[PDB]
Design a protein around this ligand. Structure first.
Ligand SMILES: *[C@@H]1O[C@H](CO)[C@@H](O)[C@H](O)[C@H]1NC(C)=O
Ligand SMILES: *[C@@H]1O[C@H](CO)[C@@H](O)[C@H](O)[C@H]1NC(C)=O
Ligand SMILES: *[C@@H]1O[C@H](CO)[C@@H](O)[C@H](O)[C@H]1NC(C)=O
Ligand SMILES: *[C@@H]1O[C@H](CO)[C@@H](O)[C@H](O)[C@H]1NC(C)=O
Length: 364
């Protein structure tokens, strides 16, 4: 861990981070659309936080929880979402289950903390939102689910930008066995790959890609929907679509390619409620311990001396460096700010808000 600077001063009068207000927002997202907020340049209270959110457990990975109190960080990145009851054990670090395979992957290499907390069910509305642009482009609008149902993807699929799930109407017009539904595809996209063959008294046997469906496809190589695990920081690339439910039977070029709601596969849902409260997960990424201006106010930080006449590493109102401090009477402090800069942008001076004393800073 990087050590705290020998001379450290925080910026005064920063706003409160209000992390608790964000965690307790009654509009709670599902892991499918996990929400992220970055907290910077503000003061937080971990002890207050753990009391104001009905905390069930809190632990840290690659970091000592007790070292948060009183510390400063460059930023604290929070990710949150409601927990479907059946998926709770997916959230163990390193788990290959559905939540981390296909919704939210917990970074295990960073310094992080996982908060398990809950909100009163009667005030919680779950926000289930499909984050995949391509799904939405071809007909996915909303979920139609019970209150407190929490969506999760089992399997995600990615497509490139020429993807269209509908068969070409000209191809479909001569199929006699297993005619696929068809429609016009957007300009700049390729029609679904389809083949007509003869076989045992079927003169016009039509088979297209992604059969029986993209999850169970015989030949994944010929299915343009490609399996994708979510990486750190990513959302589900998309539900797989049953391409036999995109387009309409005998649809011509006057119908735009559209998948029905039930064509989107490989997801499910569960309530987040137990003991009449919605259970919720939140991940804390702690960036840049012992630096920055995202600082805990849990402790009365006893301000140390400004060591003078000696090369010293410092962290002054967010700005780091090393130099030799020499106290000076106020008349020689040529500015009104708490820091003093030269022509090339380097700090040459400092005013201490704790003592109102002024100092020159020289290089070592
Ligand atoms: C939660 O909902 C109940 C009834 O709908 C209401 O009486 C209560 O004030 C709400 N709580 C909050 C914090 O809004
Ligand atoms: C939503 O689902 C319910 C069943 O839970 C059903 O009765 C209703 O018709 C559905 N509404 C729409 C718009 O699909
Ligand atoms: C998308 O993948 C298909 C694979 O069949 C390919 O034909 C097409 O050119 C690709 N499009 C782009 C933009 O890479
Ligand atoms: C943070 O906790 C300390 C210790 O109890 C307390 O004195 C201080 O008022 C708290 N500040 C906030 C903003 O909650």
């Amino acid at each position: 861990v990087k050590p705290v600077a020998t001379v450290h001063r925080r910026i005064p009068d920063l706003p409160d981070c209000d992390i608790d207000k964000w965690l307790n927002n009654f509009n709670v997202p599902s892991p499918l659309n996990w929400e992220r907020k970055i907290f910077s340049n503000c003061n937080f209270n971990l002890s207050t936080l753990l009391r104001l959110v009905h905390t069930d457990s809190f632990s840290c990975n690659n970091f000592d929880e007790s070292k948060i109190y009183g510390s400063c960080f460059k930023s604290i990145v929070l990710d949150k979402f409601a927990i479907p009851n059946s998926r709770r054990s997916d959230l163990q670090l390193g788990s290959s289950g559905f939540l981390q395979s296909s919704n939210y992957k917990i970074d295990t290499t960073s310094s992080s903390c996982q908060l398990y907390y809950s909100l009163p069910a009667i005030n919680v509305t779950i926000n289930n939102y499909n984050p995949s642009s391509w799904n939405r482009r071809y007909g996915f609008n909303n979920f139609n689910l019970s209150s407190h149902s929490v969506v999760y993807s089992r399997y995600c699929f990615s497509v490139n930008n020429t993807f269209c799930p509908c068969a070409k109407p000209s191809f479909a017009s001569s199929c006699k066995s297993h005619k696929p539904p068809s429609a016009s595809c957007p300009i700049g996209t390729n029609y679904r790959s389809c083949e007509s063959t003869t076989v045992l008294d079927h003169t016009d046997w039509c088979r297209c890609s992604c059969l029986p469906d993209p999850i169970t496809a015989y030949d994944p190589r010929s299915c343009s929907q490609k399996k994708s695990l979510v990486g750190v920081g990513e959302h589900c690339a998309g539900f797989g679509v049953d391409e036999e439910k995109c387009g309409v039977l005998d649809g011509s070029y006057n119908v735009s390619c559209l998948c029905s709601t039930d064509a989107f596969l490989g997801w499910s849902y569960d309530t987040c409620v137990s003991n009449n409260r919605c259970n919720i997960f939140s991940n804390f990424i702690l960036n840049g311990i012992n630096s920055g201006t995202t600082c805990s106010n849990d402790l009365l930080q006893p301000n140390t001396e400004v060591f003078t006449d000696v090369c010293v590493d410092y962290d002054l109102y967010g700005i780091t460096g090393q130099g030799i401090f020499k106290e000076v009477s106020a008349v020689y402090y040529n500015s009104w700010q708490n820091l003093l800069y030269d022509s090339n942008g380097n700090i040459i001076g400092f005013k201490d808000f704790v003592t109102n004393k002024t100092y020159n800073i020289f290089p070592c």
